[PDB]
Design a protein around this nucleic acid. Structure first.
Ligand SMILES: [Mg+2]
Ligand SMILES: [Mg+2]
Lengths: 157, 108, 154, 51, 48, 292, 165, 97, 142, 41, 141, 48, 102, 266, 58
RNA sequence: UAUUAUAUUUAUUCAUAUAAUUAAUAGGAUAAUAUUUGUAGUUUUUGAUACCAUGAUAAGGAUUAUAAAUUGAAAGUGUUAAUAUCAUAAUCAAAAUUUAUUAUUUAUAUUAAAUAUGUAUGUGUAGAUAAAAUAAGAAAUUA
């Protein structure tokens, strides 16, 4: 510490590790958080069994419990910083400066693609691509088709 | 060493002598591609034909990684069109009766 | 008329230069013809226009005929003369369309877009509900509510 | 609370200037312009407004 | 080139080089490996 | 169903490479492998079947399984003799021989000039194509702090791709041995290629009218109010419900009074309780599971 | 029209028959289903874009629901929502980290098994080698910076540093 | 995984992650094979029982095949338990006809 | 960045005037948070439902020594006015105090009571160049 | 075109000698490529 | 990419100035708020010009016939209760049903800002003569 | 199966093999050295 | 330790929810959860807590909503010049809602 | 001439062992022979280091509410802290206490393996939160200060390899460690089975099974933290007999056997 | 659509005006979908595994 | 001179960054028995830092033309590998406009879910500027 015997060339790479822990904290807190939200905000009766004064009471009890949880991770994902695992360059996701499937910044994607490190395939810079789905409706459509095979092809039970 | 792998097995060809026939060599102002073959592009399309690579069913070609060019997924072997279709297939075709769409809607 | 707001006027020649895209778009030309026919008046200028433009469209992908050089410049001047003829044949039409449309709107108790003349009714441009509170070109103050060109019964 | 008689630092600051003109960069004058119609020539105003 | 070294599995410029197998050659397994069969270790856990 | 269209078990192996020809040639390799192994297994099964066809006894157990019905289609307890049962068994074995033979005969079609592994008539297992995974990456090639325009004007397109072939093998029976070879093909797969295993098999389920009885709707109905959010967690138990298999006999009660109270035939109530000949007051009794 | 939804109990009909709403309550018990009491009858809107074969974007399923206000905030949204556990987020959490090999094994473990010893990172080694090279010519452009200072400030009883020139 | 996540400290969590990504167990049966004489001589699923079965399980029937996709638990075993239960519970209710 | 107003001046690039996707700009700078509306008074930059509970930040959650400023999403409550206790908020340059308590504040978040961008400008935080550019826009007198 | 065939210098059907590589060529796709294909039977 | 110049220090006694300025900006905002609430409610309560555009039909028709008959005898009371605010006026016309589908389709209504003028408005200039000291979003007279 | 690939166990197996002096087959632990040269052709000495 | 664990969507967690409720209720004194306020209870002490936004009911606003006694008006303009101080003389029987006893 | 980060440090291990052990040369890491790790920090320094490194929530940060300074300076302006007694006048105190920070064992899978809602991640294994001694989590005493320093602090000295270890952990790590560090066979060969706090629950299960309520009993069996006594398994299977439930009897037995130490083999 | 019996309800409006003049709001903030939120935006389209978009669950 | 056309159309009010500690390994049910349950030896070093500390990919139309064919280039635009010898400055929310390098909604109906912009009506009106010959539709003044 205090720049004595530092192992990595960029110190900020460590931040990337910190980020990982954030996601970990979210896995630990998501279910809990969301349940406490849903039970708190519910105006209709909770159920046949819990109604009226009991329900009001229980609602307040729960949001009191949720406020008491120190360090519970409530931060929405789009507000977490995206930072490269390689050069610790940052980019805004949903922008052309962040590349989502490798999760690296434009700067690193460029460097890694041009000196061959990533295996990708070059496609004409101006179109939609080789891909059928993108060719049809662009980004939104492909987004949809991904939803369709993750979820909708199942008739859940 | 782990690196003992990256030694040269064979002695690499020396550079003994001069630039090849019709090399790109650039005088006072010359726009020079190292890339384009000087002699084989100058040669008329009328004669040589629009082909960049042998005329063969494209399944034999792969769009190369890192190189703008295609290569053959069996090094250098080539099977002619005749070997994709059945024997004496009209316009090499799985079956002679119809084109692809004709086959589809006949089937339907 | 639904489109009421102040507008930007384009010089006739640039309107004609749109060719198939607007000025000669088949769809538009046909309902001009409908207006004339219904009023019981031949549409000659429209038909001239349609002829010229029809043919423009047919040859629109060809290269022009090869030019031999002349000190006279008779060729260049004859091409030009023909061209400005056609331009004028179409000016006449463009005028007819604006003319008859304004007149017909006068008969239908239609209110034109802002700052527009309707010969018998609004001599200076008609305006009501503009973004700007005065009449734009008179520089006179506008009444509330919007001025009425026609007597009330419908 | 209780709205004060004087405001020390509130009205103290420099007033933003009124714009002198209109349109692009607020520098355009109000004058007659090409888009202006002429109602004195023929049945159609000129240049004719879109119809 | 850098303080961070290339990782030989993900880099095609390693994988497809002359010292490894190019993607246009025939991709079969090179040699079989029997490790566990030849000399086997007895199980001793770190935990009792 | 007959021929190509029917089976006991289906396996789909989904192979995935980074390059299309990789996955194509892998599919030829794995395909020819399963052709050989498949023929060996199915041939073995076929000889077992031909022997069972030639003759054999009948389980006492299989006969008992044909004869458990309170009433058959002709409206009375039906007696299948061992003959009839053997005849059912025999008919099924017949069908299994046809199916085995069908698989074997398609294993023997694909010779060297003639091999087509795409059509299912011409080969076993066959191969289906599956549309490739293609993700296009869009990004700035510039590193510029000063202008957004110059960043946009440099934009590259590159794609990640993944290619897939599917191998389908339908078998007339289930063999753990085939399944074992098949799971183990993952150890000799081609370079940088992986796979999934889809299985669809047939399995007996059992519907118990005892555990999930079919009864009239309750005398009071259930509202929309038992369905609020969190009603799933608060107002409902998980099915099935627990119905008691044990009842205590009241004082004045008798065999038929107890049976009447429990909704049984007296015979049933005696069979479930076979240990006891007579029932005193305050004694614990087993409630026959069919009781209404 | 604004009407009262109505239900005829089968005992009251001149033929008993199973009422569709009753069946609906059955279906709600079986697959436990939230019955939204405030769902407006007027708002049935299919998603035209994805559900009509007339648009190039036609998936056959209602991709989005067309409700303007709908937000991640609402208890209803929370109740049908995919939790982040074991999704790609977890995969990123674990596999994308600064030195990728630290994902597969403890560096020290590996180093000690393969090489006899722990090895410094390449960067560290660079600074080390450089110090050795430039300590050989010039001396005393240097500084002495440690983690814990006591070892230099009170050195052990022995330790008489060799004089330098 | 045979490739990359085959052999080291990440092989475990990647494996488990695939297994949980794959929990779904699809349970099918043709309604045809449900129409059979029951042990009591009564047909197990008749016309009315089938109509009730279809209305109860809505989009869960297609081409005359009832299909339940059991996703509820992380492990496939538990999903066949769950799926099987829902099936018999749905049959139990359809059989009211 | 050109000038470093914080640490991040060193790490971040501006990228000219660059467009971000809708309602995601990396840095949440709410210039509009105090933006007067009589008719929208209770719906603008406040809770979407009046049946929502006050945020975390109106409550003492754990064993505290004390705080320096309370958060700006804290909502002003009758006790804020009545109790006569320090109510601070972190604004720039340093901190804004609610010193002169009014009931007109009640029920709104302090986001809304603190003008982010003041009409007041320090001439001493400005370079001579920057002061010139502020005179061009007709802000500073000269 | 003729306003760009300094910059199109790779783009026809070109016999190569050394084929271009991704370090040296940013957007070129290769000589065999057809961007505007016609439908042929 | 040049190294960022350091920002000059804050100011002396600027913390006091910022405190005071925000303080009384807020105190002022209380009266600006009070006044604009007064204005908003005064507007909601007071009458407006007729919302419909008389240049089109069914509104052009002489005030003794058609829609105006329908208004004078059946709708008058209600139209006056809502003070000719354009939203409830248009809704009442939908609910009177004796016009029925026409309200949105054939009939034309004045644009938002014109329809908001106080009853009695004679010249168009009025839109611009309303008070700018008050924060109603054009909902003030 | 979820735990059998941990590096501790892989390297422990290596350590066991090392104490029994059989490292020959192990991947991490062997360094191949010898290269096998190409076969000449009498069709040409020239072709490199 | 070996349990069947629900996954993904919250419905599937029925067991857990019950437990989380039981636990929460057990740990959380009503004495403390009293003090958590809803926006409307808080806003009840603002001088003008209730009126209609312009979208639906605007024309239903009454002059009776305005707290005119709270401010000072100019006779000529009809405009609010100053606001009286709210806090000093302010009496209320309900600082917290009626049902809260701390 | 000498610039240290820390003035003083201390030894991880104590006199009896060290005084003799020193005559045996130990090999230090060749490229960095001296090791000063976070075990070696003094008490004060450890406290300070442990406060920092937790972004906003953490006690180091002046505005977290846990700050011990009476004054803090924002851009030449000095701000005096508002004491909590005073903060409370307008900002009500809703404080449950430490039990609020720990969910039951029942929820450990919902939470991806944790019982603890604290700001640092808490591992149930010995090594990640290890200081000099093995890490052990108290579920009663969890505080924001975290005196035992068992949490995984993201930014402290020596943290990195700990973080890396945590990210490599196996799919059941939290759960397994929690289960094996408690619940283990006694040195006598006795089963862990009899515990005072779980006894009435086991009683209740037995009772329920004897009256033949199989589902209620199984539903209580779920909430058992510790190995249940043989008597429970006896009761539960005996209950399975009259209704013929075999699948259930078998899964009960197999549950208690070779998972739970073969309590079920009886 | 099935509705709860005994609940006062409305039918989809036939008249254009009825739709237009009702109190139905427009989308204003960013828009959410309970499944699709996990794949962030359409441009960040998060993918755990590279399965064919046409992959079919067995 | 032949291998064939710039004088058309549409545009121009352009702003946004914050609350300091980067240094190591460690495996658990259905395994023939390890409490290895709970694995405990401070202290001799100094660069990527707020700071001098080489490398490397951008943008930028000007004459290899039509056939079975692409209107985007190498001459280098923050983050990358041998020169060290002032300093912990890094997002996990809710935040402070001076910066050449940016296509905003312009008059029938107008704030419901993460909090989401109050300001400039002025005769389409200075000077000066921007973009395009590619599924569109433009045709005659080379070195
Ligand atoms: Mg450079
Ligand atoms: Mg940090």
């Amino acid at each position: 510490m205090r720049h004595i015997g530092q192992d990595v060339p960029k110190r900020h790479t460590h931040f990337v590790l910190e980020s990982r822990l954030m996601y970990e904290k979210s896995f630990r807190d998501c279910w809990l958080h969301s349940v406490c939200r849903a039970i708190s905000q519910l105006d209709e009766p909770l159920s046949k069994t819990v109604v009226g004064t009991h329900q009001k009471m229980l609602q307040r009890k729960v949001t009191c419990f949720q406020y008491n949880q120190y360090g519970l991770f409530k931060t929405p994902y789009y507000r977490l910083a995206n930072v490269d695992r390689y050069h610790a360059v940052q980019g805004v996701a949903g922008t052309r400066e962040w590349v989502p499937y490798v999760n690296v910044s434009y700067w690193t994607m460029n460097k890694m693609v041009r000196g061959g490190n990533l295996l990708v395939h070059r496609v004409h810079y101006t179109g939609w691509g080789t891909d059928s789905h993108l060719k049809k409706g662009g980004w939104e459509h492909r987004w949809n088709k991904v939803l369709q095979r993750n979820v909708l092809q199942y008739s859940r039970i | 060493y782990y690196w003992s792998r990256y030694r040269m097995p064979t002695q690499m060809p020396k550079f003994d002598g001069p630039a090849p026939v019709a090399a790109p060599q650039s005088m006072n102002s010359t726009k020079t591609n190292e890339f384009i073959d000087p002699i084989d592009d100058k040669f008329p399309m009328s004669i040589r034909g629009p082909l960049v690579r042998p005329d063969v069913p494209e399944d034999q070609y792969v769009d190369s990684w890192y190189i703008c060019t295609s290569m053959t997924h069996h090094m250098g072997d080539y099977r002619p069109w005749s070997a994709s279709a059945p024997p004496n297939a009209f316009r090499f075709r799985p079956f002679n009766e119809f084109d692809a769409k004709g086959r589809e809607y006949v089937q339907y | 008329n639904t489109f009421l707001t102040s507008s930007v006027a384009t010089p006739p020649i640039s309107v004609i230069r749109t060719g198939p895209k607007w000025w000669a778009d088949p769809e538009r030309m046909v309902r001009q013809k409908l207006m004339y026919f219904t009023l019981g008046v031949d549409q000659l200028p429209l038909r001239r226009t349609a002829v010229i433009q029809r043919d423009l469209q047919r040859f629109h992908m060809c290269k022009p005929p090869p030019r031999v050089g002349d000190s006279t410049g008779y060729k260049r001047s004859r091409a030009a003369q023909l061209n400005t003829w056609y331009r004028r044949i179409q000016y006449q039409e463009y005028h007819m369309q604006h003319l008859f449309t304004r007149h017909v709107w006068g008969l239908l108790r239609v209110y034109p877009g802002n700052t527009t003349k309707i010969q018998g009714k609004a001599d200076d441009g008609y305006v009501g509900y503009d973004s700007v509170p005065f009449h734009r070109y008179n520089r006179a103050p506008l009444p509330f509510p919007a001025r009425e060109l026609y007597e009330r019964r419908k | 609370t209780a709205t004060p008689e004087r405001f020390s630092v509130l009205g103290t600051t420099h007033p933003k200037p009124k714009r002198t003109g209109f349109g692009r960069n607020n520098k355009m004058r109000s004058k007659p312009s090409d888009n202006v119609a002429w109602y004195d020539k023929g049945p159609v105003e000129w240049l004719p407004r879109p119809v | 080139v850098g303080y961070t070294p290339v990782n030989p599995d993900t880099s095609p410029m390693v994988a497809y080089s002359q010292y490894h197998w190019h993607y246009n050659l025939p991709q079969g397994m090179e040699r079989p490996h029997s490790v566990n069969r030849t000399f086997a270790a007895p199980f001793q856990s770190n935990h009792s | 169903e007959d021929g190509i269209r029917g089976s006991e078990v289906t396996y789909k192996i989904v192979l995935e490479g980074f390059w299309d020809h990789h996955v194509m040639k892998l599919a030829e390799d794995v395909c020819m492998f399963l052709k050989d192994v498949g023929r060996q297994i199915v041939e073995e099964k076929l000889v077992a079947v031909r022997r069972l066809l030639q003759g054999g006894a009948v389980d006492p157990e299989l006969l008992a399984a044909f004869n458990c019905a309170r009433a058959g289609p002709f409206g009375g307890l039906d007696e299948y003799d061992k003959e009839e049962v053997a005849n059912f068994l025999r008919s099924d074995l017949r069908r299994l021989e046809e199916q085995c033979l069908s698989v074997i005969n398609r294993c023997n079609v694909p010779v060297p000039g003639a091999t087509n592994i795409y059509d299912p008539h011409t080969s076993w297992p066959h191969v289906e194509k599956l549309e490739p995974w293609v993700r296009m990456a869009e990004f700035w090639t510039s590193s510029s702090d000063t202008s957004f325009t110059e960043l946009e004007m440099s934009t590259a397109h590159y794609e990640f791709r993944k290619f897939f072939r599917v191998i389908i093998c339908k078998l007339p029976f289930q063999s753990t041995e085939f399944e074992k070879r098949m799971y183990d093909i993952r150890h000799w797969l081609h370079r940088q290629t992986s796979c999934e295993f889809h299985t669809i098999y047939r399995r007996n389920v059992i519907h118990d009218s005892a555990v999930f009885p079919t009864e009239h709707d309750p005398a009071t109905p259930t509202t929309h109010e038992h369905h609020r959010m969190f009603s799933f967690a608060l107002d409902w138990q998980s099915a099935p419900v627990n119905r008691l298999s044990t009842d205590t006999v009241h004082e004045g009660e008798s065999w038929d009074a107890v049976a009447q109270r429990l909704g049984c035939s007296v015979g049933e109530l005696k069979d479930a309780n076979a240990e006891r000949e007579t029932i005193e007051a305050g004694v614990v009794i087993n409630v026959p599971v069919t009781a209404t | 029209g604004v009407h009262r939804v109505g239900y005829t109990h089968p005992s009251t009909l001149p033929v008993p028959c199973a009422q569709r709403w009753d069946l609906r309550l059955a279906r709600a018990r079986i697959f436990q289903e939230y019955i939204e009491e405030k769902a407006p009858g007027a708002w049935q809107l299919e998603d035209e874009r994805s559900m009509s074969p007339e648009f190039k974007t036609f998936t056959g399923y209602p991709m989005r629901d067309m409700r303007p206000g709908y937000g991640q905030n609402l208890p209803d949204y929370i109740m049908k929502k995919r939790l982040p556990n074991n999704t790609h987020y977890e995969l990123f959490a674990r596999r994308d980290i600064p030195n990728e090999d630290n994902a597969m094994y403890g560096k020290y473990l590996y180093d000690m098994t393969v090489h006899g010893t722990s090895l410094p990172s390449t960067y560290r080694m660079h600074k080390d080698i450089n110090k050795a090279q430039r300590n050989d010519r010039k001396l005393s452009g240097n500084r002495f910076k440690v983690l814990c200072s006591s070892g230099a400030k009170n050195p052990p009883s022995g330790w008489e540093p060799i004089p330098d020139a | 995984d045979n490739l990359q996540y085959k052999r080291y400290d990440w092989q475990g969590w990647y494996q488990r992650m695939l297994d949980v990504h794959n929990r779904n167990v699809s349970l099918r049966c043709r309604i045809c094979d449900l129409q059979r004489l029951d042990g009591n001589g009564v047909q197990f699923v008749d016309m009315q029982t089938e109509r009730r079965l279809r209305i109860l399980a809505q989009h869960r029937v297609g081409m005359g095949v009832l299909k339940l996709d059991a996703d509820k638990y992380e492990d496939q075993a538990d999903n066949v338990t769950f799926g099987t239960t829902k099936l018999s519970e749905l049959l139990a209710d359809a059989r009211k006809a | 960045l050109k000038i470093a107003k914080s640490a991040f001046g060193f790490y971040l690039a501006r990228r000219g005037q660059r467009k971000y996707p809708f309602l995601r700009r990396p840095h949440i700078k709410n210039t509009h948070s105090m933006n007067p509306s009589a008719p929208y008074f209770w719906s603008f930059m406040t809770a979407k439902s009046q049946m929502a509970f006050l945020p975390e930040e109106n409550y003492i959650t754990g064993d505290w020594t004390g705080k320096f400023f309370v958060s700006k999403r804290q909502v002003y409550t009758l006790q804020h006015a009545t109790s006569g206790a320090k109510v601070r908020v972190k604004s720039f340059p340093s901190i804004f105090e609610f010193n002169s308590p009014s009931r007109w504040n009640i029920g709104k978040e302090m986001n809304t009571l603190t003008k982010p961008r003041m009409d007041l400008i320090d001439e001493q935080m400005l370079t001579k160049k920057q002061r010139l550019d502020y005179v061009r826009a007709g802000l500073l007198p000269k | 075109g003729h306003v760009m065939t300094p910059h199109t210098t790779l783009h026809g059907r070109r016999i190569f000698w050394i084929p271009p590589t991704w370090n040296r060529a940013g957007r070129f796709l290769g000589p065999h490529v057809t961007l505007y294909p016609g439908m042929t039977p | 990419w040049a190294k960022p110049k350091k920002r000059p220090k804050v100011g002396q006694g600027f913390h006091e100035k910022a405190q005071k300025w925000r303080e009384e900006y807020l105190l002022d905002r209380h009266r600006a708020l009070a006044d604009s609430l007064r204005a908003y409610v005064e507007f909601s309560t007071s009458k407006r010009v007729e919302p419909w555009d008389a240049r089109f039909k069914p509104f052009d028709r002489i005030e003794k016939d058609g829609v105006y008959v329908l208004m004078r005898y059946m709708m008058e009371e209600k139209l006056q209760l809502c003070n000719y605010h354009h939203r409830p006026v248009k809704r009442l016309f939908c609910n009177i049903g004796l016009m029925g589908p026409q309200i949105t389709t054939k009939a034309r209504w004045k644009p938002y800002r014109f329809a908001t003028n106080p009853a009695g408005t004679s010249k168009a200039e009025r839109m611009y003569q309303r008070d700018k000291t008050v924060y109603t979003h054009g909902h003030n007279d | 199966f979820y735990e059998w690939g941990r590096a501790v166990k892989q390297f422990d197996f290596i350590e066991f093999r090392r104490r029994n002096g059989w490292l020959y087959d192990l991947h991490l632990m062997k360094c191949t050295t010898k290269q096998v040269g190409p076969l000449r052709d009498f069709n040409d000495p020239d072709a490199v | 330790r070996y349990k069947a664990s629900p996954h993904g969507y919250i419905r599937h967690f029925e067991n857990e929810v019950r437990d989380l409720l039981q636990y929460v209720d057990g740990v959380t004194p009503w004495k403390q959860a009293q003090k958590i306020r809803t926006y409307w209870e808080v806003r009840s002490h603002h001088p003008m807590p209730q009126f209609n936004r312009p979208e639906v009911a605007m024309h239903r606003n009454t002059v009776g909503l305005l707290p005119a006694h709270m401010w000072e008006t100019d006779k000529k303009t009809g405009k609010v010049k100053s606001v009286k101080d709210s806090v000093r003389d302010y009496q209320t029987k309900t600082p917290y809602p009626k049902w809260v006893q701390l | 001439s000498v610039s240290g980060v820390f003035s003083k440090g201390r030894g991880i291990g104590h006199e009896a062992t060290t005084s003799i052990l020193r005559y045996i040369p130990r090999a230090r890491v060749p490229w960095q022979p001296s090791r000063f790790g976070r075990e070696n920090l003094t008490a004060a320094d450890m406290a300070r280091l442990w406060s920092r490194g937790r972004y906003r929530d953490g006690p180091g940060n002046y505005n977290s509410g846990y700050c011990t300074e009476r004054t803090h300076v924002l851009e030449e302006n000095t701000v005096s802290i508002i004491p909590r007694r005073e903060l409370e006048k307008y900002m009500p105190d809703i404080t449950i206490g430490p039990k609020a920070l720990v969910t039951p064992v029942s929820l450990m899978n919902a939470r991806n393996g944790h019982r603890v809602t604290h700001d640092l991640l808490h591992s149930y294994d010995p090594h990640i939160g290890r200081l000099g001694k093995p890490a052990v989590v108290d579920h009663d005493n969890i505080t924001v200060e975290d005196p035992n320093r068992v949490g995984l602090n993201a930014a402290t000295l020596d943290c990195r390899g700990r973080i890396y270890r945590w990210l490599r952990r196996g799919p059941f790590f939290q759960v397994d460690n929690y289960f094996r560090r408690s619940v283990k066979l006694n040195r006598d060969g006795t089963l862990p089975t009899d515990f005072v706090h779980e006894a009435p629950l086991m009683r209740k299960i037995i009772r329920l099974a004897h009256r033949g309520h199989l589902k209620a009993a199984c539903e209580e069996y779920r909430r058992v933290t510790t190995v249940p006594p043989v008597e429970v398994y006896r009761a539960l299977t005996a209950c399975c007999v009259p209704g013929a439930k075999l699948a259930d009897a078998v899964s009960i037995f197999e549950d208690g056997d070779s998972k739970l130490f073969y309590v079920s083999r009886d | 659509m099935q509705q709860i019996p005994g609940k006062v309800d409305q039918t989809p409006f036939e008249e254009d005006q009825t739709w237009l003049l009702h109190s139905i709001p427009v989308q204003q903030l960013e828009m959410h979908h309970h499944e699709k939120d996990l794949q962030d935006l359409p441009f960040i389209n998060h993918e755990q595994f590279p399965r064919s978009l046409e992959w079919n669950a067995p």
